[PDB]
Design a protein around this ligand. Structure first.
Ligand code: MG
Ligand code: MG
Ligand code: MG
Ligand code: MG
Ligand code: MG
Ligand code: MG
Ligand code: MG
Ligand code: MG
Ligand code: MG
Ligand code: MG
Ligand code: MG
Ligand code: MG
Ligand code: MG
Ligand code: MG
Ligand code: MG
Ligand code: MG
Ligand code: MG
Ligand code: MG
Ligand code: MG
Ligand code: MG
Ligand code: MG
Ligand code: MG
Ligand code: MG
Ligand code: MG
Ligand code: MG
Ligand code: MG
Ligand code: MG
Ligand code: MG
Ligand code: MG
Ligand code: MG
Ligand code: MG
Ligand code: MG
Ligand code: MG
Ligand code: MG
Ligand code: MG
Ligand code: MG
Ligand code: MG
Ligand code: MG
Ligand code: MG
Ligand code: MG
Ligand code: MG
Ligand code: MG
Ligand code: MG
Ligand code: MG
Ligand code: MG
Ligand code: MG
Ligand code: MG
Ligand code: MG
Ligand code: MG
Ligand code: MG
Ligand code: MG
Ligand code: MG
Ligand code: MG
Ligand code: MG
Ligand code: MG
Ligand code: MG
Ligand code: MG
Ligand code: MG
Ligand code: MG
Ligand code: MG
Ligand code: MG
Ligand code: MG
Ligand code: MG
Ligand code: MG
Ligand code: MG
Ligand code: MG
Ligand code: MG
Ligand code: MG
Ligand code: MG
Ligand code: MG
Ligand code: MG
Ligand code: MG
Ligand code: MG
Ligand code: MG
Ligand code: MG
Ligand code: MG
Ligand code: MG
Ligand code: MG
Ligand code: MG
Ligand code: MG
Ligand code: MG
Ligand code: MG
Ligand code: MG
Ligand code: MG
Ligand code: MG
Ligand code: MG
Ligand code: MG
Ligand code: MG
Ligand code: MG
Ligand code: MG
Ligand code: MG
Ligand code: MG
Ligand code: MG
Ligand code: MG
Ligand code: MG
Ligand code: MG
Ligand code: MG
Ligand code: MG
Ligand code: MG
Ligand code: MG
Ligand code: MG
Ligand code: MG
Ligand code: MG
Ligand code: MG
Ligand code: MG
Ligand code: MG
Ligand code: MG
Ligand code: MG
Ligand code: MG
Ligand code: MG
Ligand code: MG
Ligand code: MG
Ligand code: MG
Ligand code: MG
Ligand code: MG
Ligand code: MG
Ligand code: MG
Ligand code: MG
Ligand code: MG
Ligand code: MG
Ligand code: MG
Ligand code: MG
Ligand code: MG
Ligand code: MG
Ligand code: MG
Ligand code: MG
Ligand code: MG
Ligand code: MG
Ligand code: MG
Ligand code: MG
Ligand code: MG
Ligand code: MG
Ligand code: MG
Ligand code: MG
Ligand code: MG
Ligand code: MG
Ligand code: MG
Ligand code: MG
Ligand code: MG
Ligand code: MG
Ligand code: MG
Ligand code: MG
Ligand code: MG
Ligand code: MG
Ligand code: MG
Ligand code: MG
Ligand code: MG
Ligand code: MG
Ligand code: MG
Ligand code: MG
Ligand code: MG
Ligand code: MG
Ligand code: MG
Ligand code: MG
Ligand code: MG
Ligand code: MG
Ligand code: MG
Ligand code: MG
Ligand code: MG
Ligand code: MG
Ligand code: MG
Ligand code: MG
Ligand code: MG
Ligand code: MG
Ligand code: MG
Ligand code: MG
Ligand code: MG
Ligand code: MG
Ligand code: MG
Ligand code: MG
Ligand code: MG
Ligand code: MG
Ligand code: MG
Ligand code: MG
Ligand code: MG
Ligand code: MG
Ligand code: MG
Ligand code: MG
Ligand code: MG
Ligand code: MG
Ligand code: MG
Ligand code: MG
Ligand code: MG
Ligand code: MG
Ligand code: MG
Ligand code: MG
Ligand code: MG
Ligand code: MG
Ligand code: MG
Ligand code: MG
Ligand code: MG
Ligand code: MG
Ligand code: MG
Ligand code: MG
Ligand code: MG
Ligand code: MG
Ligand code: MG
Ligand code: MG
Ligand code: MG
Ligand code: MG
Ligand code: MG
Ligand code: MG
Ligand code: MG
Ligand code: MG
Ligand code: MG
Ligand code: MG
Ligand code: MG
Ligand code: MG
Ligand code: MG
Ligand code: MG
Ligand code: MG
Ligand code: MG
Ligand code: MG
Ligand code: MG
Ligand code: MG
Ligand code: MG
Ligand code: MG
Ligand code: MG
Ligand code: MG
Ligand code: MG
Ligand code: MG
Ligand code: MG
Ligand code: MG
Ligand code: MG
Ligand code: MG
Ligand code: MG
Ligand code: MG
Ligand code: MG
Ligand code: MG
Ligand code: MG
Ligand code: MG
Ligand code: MG
Ligand code: MG
Ligand code: MG
Ligand code: MG
Ligand code: MG
Ligand code: MG
Ligand code: MG
Ligand code: MG
Ligand code: MG
Ligand code: MG
Ligand code: MG
Ligand code: MG
Ligand code: MG
Ligand code: MG
Ligand code: MG
Ligand code: MG
Ligand code: MG
Ligand code: MG
Ligand code: MG
Ligand code: MG
Ligand code: MG
Ligand code: MG
Ligand code: MG
Ligand code: MG
Ligand code: MG
Ligand code: MG
Ligand code: MG
Ligand code: MG
Ligand code: MG
Ligand code: MG
Ligand code: MG
Ligand code: MG
Ligand code: MG
Ligand code: MG
Lengths: 275, 48
RNA sequence: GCGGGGUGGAGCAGCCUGGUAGCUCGUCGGGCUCAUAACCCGAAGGUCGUCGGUUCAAAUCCGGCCCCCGCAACCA
RNA sequence: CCGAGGGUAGGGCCCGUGACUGGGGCGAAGUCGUAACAAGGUAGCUGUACCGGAAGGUGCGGCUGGAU
RNA sequence: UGGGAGAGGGUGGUGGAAUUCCCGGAGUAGCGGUGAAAUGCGCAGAUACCGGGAGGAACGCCGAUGGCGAAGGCAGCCAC
RNA sequence: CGAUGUCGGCUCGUCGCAUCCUGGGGCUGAAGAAGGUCCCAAGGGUUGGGCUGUUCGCCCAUUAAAGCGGCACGCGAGCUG
RNA sequence: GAAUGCCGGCAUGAGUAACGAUAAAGAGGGUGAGAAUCCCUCUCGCCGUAAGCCCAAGGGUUCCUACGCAAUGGUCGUCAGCGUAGGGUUAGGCGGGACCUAAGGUGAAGCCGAAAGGCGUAGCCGAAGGGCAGCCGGUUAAUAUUCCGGCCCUUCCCGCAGGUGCGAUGGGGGGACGCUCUAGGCUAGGGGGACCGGAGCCAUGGACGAGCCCGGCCAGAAGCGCAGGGUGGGAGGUAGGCAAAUCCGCCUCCCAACAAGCUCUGCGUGGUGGGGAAGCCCGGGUGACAACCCCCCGAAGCCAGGGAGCCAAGAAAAGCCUCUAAGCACAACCUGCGGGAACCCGUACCGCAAACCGACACAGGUGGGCGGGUGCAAGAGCACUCAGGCGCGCGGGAGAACCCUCGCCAAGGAACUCUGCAAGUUGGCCCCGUAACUUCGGGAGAAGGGGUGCUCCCUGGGGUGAUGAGCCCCGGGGAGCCGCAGUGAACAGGCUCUGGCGACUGUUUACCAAAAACACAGCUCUCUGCGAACUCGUAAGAGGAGGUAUAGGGAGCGACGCUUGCCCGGUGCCGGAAGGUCAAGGGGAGGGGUGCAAGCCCCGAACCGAAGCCCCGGUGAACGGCGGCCGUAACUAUAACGGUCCUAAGGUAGCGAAAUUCCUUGUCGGGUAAGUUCCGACCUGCACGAAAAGCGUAACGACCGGAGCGCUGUCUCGGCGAGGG
RNA sequence: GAGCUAGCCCUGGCCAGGGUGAAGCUGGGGUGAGACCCAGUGGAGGCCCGAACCGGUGGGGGAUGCAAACCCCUCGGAUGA
RNA sequence: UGGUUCGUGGAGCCAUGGGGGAAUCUGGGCGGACCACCGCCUAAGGCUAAGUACUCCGGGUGACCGAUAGCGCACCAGUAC
């Protein structure tokens, strides 16, 4: 339930911030936080390879457990739900009966002080992880390994989820958050339920400064530039694109499909995305 | 206003210094030439 | 300056490829209707902007003149 | 001290008027169509939405004050 | 206090018929549509038939001149 | 073209006369007053404002009159821009 | 003899401009061959959130002293940051190293690249970050937390005693963190004292005083006192912290919980060691047995790792504590005490500048701390002033024009000009009061007005203390006094009405443009299923992202409001297993060369044969495009209506002489005495129009228009005065 | 060659004083309970005024300069992109 | 595809990044597409003086310079700046 401000500044008119209601702990588990190296968009050559990045708030990276088969059968208690600035979702702190502590990302409806567990025989109850084949067909699910033992890859962003449609052999058919129908291997783990913090998309950053807080530096349009800088650069006064709208590097940017043609995973995608 | 020369003994030494020269091929050939020409000082004097 | 046009009453084909001008509307006479329109059957009307030339023969090809749009008239 | 009123500044209400603009009423014999009264030739009316030279048309839902 | 009837309302659950679309099969020269047609769709294999899948929406018979609500209004089934 | 800096304004003027006013005249379809037209005449004078970058032009209020040109469309080693 | 030739010399301009902030000078005395310029004294002025003091960077003997004046110094020079010579920088505690890690750099392993080289986990290097033991005073011409004095402390080595399962580059804890706001108690610093110490002073009309002037402290171990921070104790189980673990984590059990206790800082006190003024006398000596106390103000600094709220969610490693492991318990470590040991480098001086960066002793540039007092509402603002430091390295005269900076002005008041350009006006505080419109915040300091000093009297509340006095802080009422004037000096908005453009705060052409331009939240399209797309790279490898479609790349549009129409024929993109074309390769009908021949060698048709192109569709917040002629109504005029040619389709809502209208100063209305601009309308829109968005929009703007009030030397129209030339 | 300048990374530091007064919280009120209203408390913000600091709007001076971008008056930002 | 005079040319020869892939003398390469004949030569392992190139160094000699010449430097020069 996003929070509103009164229009006591120009920017507070539309600025909205998250409610943080589901959060119970306001400083991270010291045993699970390591420093996050800000890059500013530059690679090991020193070159900007992703434009308009930098200048954002300092952050500590929280180690997240995307391979919950690491601890089969060991029930954990949900001890907290915390902010993670490296994510759109929230994270939940788990106290295993083992004594070990880990971070998973928080599904919607997960309550502190409840049990979760992972394994082939786990109950079909929000927050539990099972290999995809044992989850009943029709279930919503998140944090899905794209390949067995390689790590939870799909549906990790706030509010997202994947639904299980059916099976054929060693594979189950998933409706991804995009609408794509894909075969994913049944031995791939997945956590039941959709990711929490669904109102994340309903936030209005409100002013330019908020973008700078998130590390996002001002984007400058090709039309604003000169021909030495962009296909859209130049012109006396304003100017329409005057050619197929291109990127800074020459390729067309309004429809040109860029997925590799002979990519071996094509055998497993069933229906390309919707909308 | 603010001019271009803003001296700094660490910057001077780590940029034009002797050990900076020997590390790269062009730096070595710089020292090679200044030797050949007979320069009294092959690298800037900066007293740390 | 460059380009395209002028032909029955109105709006357009024919000109490029010389001989023969055609389409819709309108106009005239007749039908149907109690009557009008619509509709149906028939018919008339154009020397092709003008003068000159080529030709056996010019709406048609070449030249001038009249006119109509369209484009340009930049560095100053 | 108060004090008629004069002066400066800012409000409120009404009245007349105003290039132009909106529809309205009325006007013996204008132009276009034919929406309604017969099932009026697509039953009509209706609240709303969108559209159209115009009456209107159409979608959604409702009413019979609809025929057979 | 003891009982009854009911599409009264809200939440969640779920069941079948139908249409569209998708895939496999089999199959051929038309399908569709109207007052009559054309547009459209079909040898790039449609229409018609069978099997599988996805999804949304509305609840056939019961059903009635019926029942419920203050009105607007309320119809598969189950539970709160 | 191994550089002769543009329009307009401001400042400072100076000359020409094809004269706007003032002085002297002839003719008048000149009664007077006031005009028309032409001749002589360059001594002096020839206003303030609204609009526009404007020169010009239109307008307001006056005026004896609100003249027209030349001086590198006078004048940026004088100003403005 | 010429090349705006080259190098050098010397002219011309010319005794000309200038001699570098307008903070400012004058006299006496001295030194000396020589003095506006050096030394001393008295008087005058300037800075004083500095133009004073202290660090850092950079500079590198410029520091102190003697002797010098050729050049350097914009003049002079006896002087100097100049010449010559001598002297001067002292550390276990300050800073750096023998400690740690950050970005980054490097790089056993490993990967990659013609060569050169590029990557890369560990590890190593890397600091103004972490960690770590010295405070006060004296002394030199010149160094001082470094020498000396006083009082403290750290580490290493060996020894003694007491205690313990001792032991680590391995495990764990800790270190360890943001932004704003902030409590309590202190310290720095400051104000006052009718108290304490002091050489003195009585003037020029008065005062021998509760007179004037000066000063009234700094450091300190243990112990104690005040204020804080940090911190539960025990037991059982244990599968996790990549071996172990008695530690940590997880579970249950029993006690203590705003406490207390234990520990750790700050402040006060503290044995003791130092300091100690004005004035006088020659940096010294005296004052002086100096005194060293009371009250108030009081931090942004301290207690500190304090508290609270918020979102944008806020380093690492070591020291340190704990756990164990090999090994070892003749050890080893922990504690207390003693003796010994404790290396290298910096240390002068300048340091908002005459010593650094600007060719200069250059009106420019340069990070951190301290930065006193009074009054003005506050303050680091402003005026004066303390400590301290200066008068800016050419002067003297004169009293023109003209230039600069400044003061004033009769009557008028924008008549100036492209334009109120510039300069006036307004100006802080307290109180009264405040419109359209609005997104209900705003517009707003709207507008406009009153008050403001000093004296006497009465009184309300707060802090400290005690609840009282005292000092200090917010106030209210009554009566008066004076001047032209009471924020009496200085610092301190002119206002309003209405358009255009851009929502807004922001950004930009360093050195002619700060804008209407860029950015911006927000909207849409499109790409991307992750070894993502995209980007940098030959590659390895990186960014993307330790992210996963509520995400990431690209593009246009640009808050918000109401909206965004028709065209897919062309171009782009997307879809389409048919057809057409199509390269190498397959195929080899059929020819050729050569040989006696077996054979070797060459050419070569049909046919099969990818993408691309053709072809069939889709697609506009994709590139883009959105007609002409003629006729028609019972006055005229004009056409709701009609005819016909064309097109892929013929511009919709809204707006319109516009940042767009050529003809144009269109026409009409408003405002003006007068209006090529302005504002409101009309619509024959040369040549608006809907995300190169269309039409509006409160708020905002050193943006560009128009008008008005206020006020003025802008002007009629100039005059006088000041200072630097 | 990034000791100027531009962006980013890591690590530190700086921003006098005054003004306005969001949410929340407390109490009151209101209702079936609510929404909501009022007062107090609170101290939010690419909020407002104005030094330091960062700028460079208009004008004047300077133009073989004090200066190869300076000086004076004035003006913008100043808890934030 | 490179080398050769050889730029696709009748394009051999020498070399070789890709593909296919033998033989040991009765074997193999060459004589400018190719074939016959006639000849030359023995690939896929290595080494090898001398004659040749150069002048930092030393000496000798000039119809070479003679301080603006001759080396940038006759001299404390790759210095000062
Ligand atoms: Mg909001
Ligand atoms: Mg939340
Ligand atoms: Mg990263
Ligand atoms: Mg790197
Ligand atoms: Mg590199
Ligand atoms: Mg990029
Ligand atoms: Mg970037
Ligand atoms: Mg994310
Ligand atoms: Mg989160
Ligand atoms: Mg799989
Ligand atoms: Mg958003
Ligand atoms: Mg961020
Ligand atoms: Mg963005
Ligand atoms: Mg942009
Ligand atoms: Mg551009
Ligand atoms: Mg541009
Ligand atoms: Mg470039
Ligand atoms: Mg290019
Ligand atoms: Mg280009
Ligand atoms: Mg372009
Ligand atoms: Mg452009
Ligand atoms: Mg442009
Ligand atoms: Mg244009
Ligand atoms: Mg466009
Ligand atoms: Mg174009
Ligand atoms: Mg393009
Ligand atoms: Mg897909
Ligand atoms: Mg600079
Ligand atoms: Mg620097
Ligand atoms: Mg340095
Ligand atoms: Mg340094
Ligand atoms: Mg450096
Ligand atoms: Mg070096
Ligand atoms: Mg280097
Ligand atoms: Mg080498
Ligand atoms: Mg030497
Ligand atoms: Mg060098
Ligand atoms: Mg015709
Ligand atoms: Mg035709
Ligand atoms: Mg033709
Ligand atoms: Mg005919
Ligand atoms: Mg009859
Ligand atoms: Mg008829
Ligand atoms: Mg003829
Ligand atoms: Mg003829
Ligand atoms: Mg013909
Ligand atoms: Mg009166
Ligand atoms: Mg009808
Ligand atoms: Mg009808
Ligand atoms: Mg009909
Ligand atoms: Mg009808
Ligand atoms: Mg319709
Ligand atoms: Mg067919
Ligand atoms: Mg077929
Ligand atoms: Mg569906
Ligand atoms: Mg010329
Ligand atoms: Mg010349
Ligand atoms: Mg010249
Ligand atoms: Mg000249
Ligand atoms: Mg006369
Ligand atoms: Mg007369
Ligand atoms: Mg008369
Ligand atoms: Mg005259
Ligand atoms: Mg004019
Ligand atoms: Mg002219
Ligand atoms: Mg004109
Ligand atoms: Mg007269
Ligand atoms: Mg002339
Ligand atoms: Mg001229
Ligand atoms: Mg001329
Ligand atoms: Mg001319
Ligand atoms: Mg001229
Ligand atoms: Mg000039
Ligand atoms: Mg001029
Ligand atoms: Mg001129
Ligand atoms: Mg001149
Ligand atoms: Mg001249
Ligand atoms: Mg100009
Ligand atoms: Mg100008
Ligand atoms: Mg000659
Ligand atoms: Mg020359
Ligand atoms: Mg020369
Ligand atoms: Mg010379
Ligand atoms: Mg000489
Ligand atoms: Mg000379
Ligand atoms: Mg001479
Ligand atoms: Mg001379
Ligand atoms: Mg001379
Ligand atoms: Mg002269
Ligand atoms: Mg000079
Ligand atoms: Mg000067
Ligand atoms: Mg000054
Ligand atoms: Mg001055
Ligand atoms: Mg004197
Ligand atoms: Mg003197
Ligand atoms: Mg002297
Ligand atoms: Mg002298
Ligand atoms: Mg002096
Ligand atoms: Mg002296
Ligand atoms: Mg004296
Ligand atoms: Mg002061
Ligand atoms: Mg120096
Ligand atoms: Mg001298
Ligand atoms: Mg001398
Ligand atoms: Mg001498
Ligand atoms: Mg000198
Ligand atoms: Mg001298
Ligand atoms: Mg000098
Ligand atoms: Mg001298
Ligand atoms: Mg002397
Ligand atoms: Mg010394
Ligand atoms: Mg010591
Ligand atoms: Mg050692
Ligand atoms: Mg290290
Ligand atoms: Mg090399
Ligand atoms: Mg290497
Ligand atoms: Mg290093
Ligand atoms: Mg180091
Ligand atoms: Mg350090
Ligand atoms: Mg830190
Ligand atoms: Mg230390
Ligand atoms: Mg101490
Ligand atoms: Mg000391
Ligand atoms: Mg340890
Ligand atoms: Mg911590
Ligand atoms: Mg915050
Ligand atoms: Mg103290
Ligand atoms: Mg005080
Ligand atoms: Mg005494
Ligand atoms: Mg265990
Ligand atoms: Mg377990
Ligand atoms: Mg501490
Ligand atoms: Mg004594
Ligand atoms: Mg501070
Ligand atoms: Mg602290
Ligand atoms: Mg690290
Ligand atoms: Mg053992
Ligand atoms: Mg033993
Ligand atoms: Mg022990
Ligand atoms: Mg050593
Ligand atoms: Mg020292
Ligand atoms: Mg100093
Ligand atoms: Mg300064
Ligand atoms: Mg400083
Ligand atoms: Mg100095
Ligand atoms: Mg110097
Ligand atoms: Mg300079
Ligand atoms: Mg000086
Ligand atoms: Mg200076
Ligand atoms: Mg004081
Ligand atoms: Mg005083
Ligand atoms: Mg006072
Ligand atoms: Mg004040
Ligand atoms: Mg002076
Ligand atoms: Mg000064
Ligand atoms: Mg001076
Ligand atoms: Mg004189
Ligand atoms: Mg005055
Ligand atoms: Mg006066
Ligand atoms: Mg006056
Ligand atoms: Mg006035
Ligand atoms: Mg006035
Ligand atoms: Mg005016
Ligand atoms: Mg004038
Ligand atoms: Mg202007
Ligand atoms: Mg003032
Ligand atoms: Mg009003
Ligand atoms: Mg109001
Ligand atoms: Mg408004
Ligand atoms: Mg309001
Ligand atoms: Mg006021
Ligand atoms: Mg007020
Ligand atoms: Mg009063
Ligand atoms: Mg007084
Ligand atoms: Mg102000
Ligand atoms: Mg703006
Ligand atoms: Mg807007
Ligand atoms: Mg915007
Ligand atoms: Mg904006
Ligand atoms: Mg700002
Ligand atoms: Mg510029
Ligand atoms: Mg420029
Ligand atoms: Mg700048
Ligand atoms: Mg420049
Ligand atoms: Mg400028
Ligand atoms: Mg600006
Ligand atoms: Mg500028
Ligand atoms: Mg820009
Ligand atoms: Mg933009
Ligand atoms: Mg939007
Ligand atoms: Mg969207
Ligand atoms: Mg690339
Ligand atoms: Mg990563
Ligand atoms: Mg734009
Ligand atoms: Mg609105
Ligand atoms: Mg559109
Ligand atoms: Mg349309
Ligand atoms: Mg199209
Ligand atoms: Mg198409
Ligand atoms: Mg198309
Ligand atoms: Mg087109
Ligand atoms: Mg067509
Ligand atoms: Mg519409
Ligand atoms: Mg118009
Ligand atoms: Mg107009
Ligand atoms: Mg407009
Ligand atoms: Mg236009
Ligand atoms: Mg024109
Ligand atoms: Mg016009
Ligand atoms: Mg015009
Ligand atoms: Mg006009
Ligand atoms: Mg008027
Ligand atoms: Mg208008
Ligand atoms: Mg018109
Ligand atoms: Mg148009
Ligand atoms: Mg607006
Ligand atoms: Mg507005
Ligand atoms: Mg603005
Ligand atoms: Mg701004
Ligand atoms: Mg602006
Ligand atoms: Mg005005
Ligand atoms: Mg004047
Ligand atoms: Mg004077
Ligand atoms: Mg930099
Ligand atoms: Mg730097
Ligand atoms: Mg910081
Ligand atoms: Mg600040
Ligand atoms: Mg105030
Ligand atoms: Mg309050
Ligand atoms: Mg505040
Ligand atoms: Mg602000
Ligand atoms: Mg304010
Ligand atoms: Mg300036
Ligand atoms: Mg000004
Ligand atoms: Mg200049
Ligand atoms: Mg300045
Ligand atoms: Mg100023
Ligand atoms: Mg200001
Ligand atoms: Mg401000
Ligand atoms: Mg501030
Ligand atoms: Mg060759
Ligand atoms: Mg060849
Ligand atoms: Mg090969
Ligand atoms: Mg043989
Ligand atoms: Mg053989
Ligand atoms: Mg061979
Ligand atoms: Mg041979
Ligand atoms: Mg041969
Ligand atoms: Mg041979
Ligand atoms: Mg052999
Ligand atoms: Mg051989
Ligand atoms: Mg060989
Ligand atoms: Mg031999
Ligand atoms: Mg040899
Ligand atoms: Mg020799
Ligand atoms: Mg000779
Ligand atoms: Mg010589
Ligand atoms: Mg020589
Ligand atoms: Mg010679
Ligand atoms: Mg030599
Ligand atoms: Mg030599
Ligand atoms: Mg030489
Ligand atoms: Mg020489
Ligand atoms: Mg030398
Ligand atoms: Mg040198």
């Amino acid at each position: 339930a996003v929070k509103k401000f009164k229009p006591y500044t120009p920017s507070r008119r539309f600025m909205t911030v998250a409610d943080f209601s589901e959060i119970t702990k306001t400083e991270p588990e010291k045993s699970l936080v390591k420093p996050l190296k800000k890059t500013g968009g530059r690679n090991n050559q020193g070159r900007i390879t992703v434009r308009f990045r930098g200048g954002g708030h300092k952050r500590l990276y929280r180690i997240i457990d995307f391979k919950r088969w690491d601890k089969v059968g060991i029930p954990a208690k949900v001890a907290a739900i915390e902010y993670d600035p490296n994510r759109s979702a929230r994270i939940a702190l788990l106290h295993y009966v083992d004594g070990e502590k880990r971070y998973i990302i928080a599904p919607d409806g997960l309550q502190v002080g409840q049990q979760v567990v992972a394994g082939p025989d786990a109950p079909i109850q929000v927050g539990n992880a099972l290999p995809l084949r044992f989850i009943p067909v029709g279930t919503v699910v998140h944090a899905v390994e794209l390949e067995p033992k390689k790590g939870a890859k799909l549906a990790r962003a706030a509010g997202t989820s994947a639904q299980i449609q059916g099976r054929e052999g060693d594979y189950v058919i998933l409706r991804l958050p995009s609408g794509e129908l894909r075969k994913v291997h049944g031995e791939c783990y997945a956590t039941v339920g959709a990711v929490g913090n669904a109102d994340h998309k309903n936030i209005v950053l409100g002013k330019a400064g908020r973008s700078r807080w998130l590390g996002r530096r001002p984007h400058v349009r090709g039309a604003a530039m000169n021909p030495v800088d962009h296909p859209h650069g130049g012109g006396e006064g304003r100017a329409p694109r005057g050619r197929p709208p291109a990127s800074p590097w020459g390729w067309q940017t309004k429809g040109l499909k860029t997925r590799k043609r002979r990519k071996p995973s094509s055998r497993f995608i069933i229906a390309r995305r919707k909308k | 206003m603010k001019r271009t020369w803003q001296p700094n003994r660490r910057k001077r030494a780590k940029t034009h210094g002797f050990r900076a020269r020997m590390r790269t091929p062009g730096g070595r050939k710089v020292l090679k030439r200044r030797r050949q020409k007979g320069r009294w000082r092959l690298t800037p004097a900066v007293r740390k």
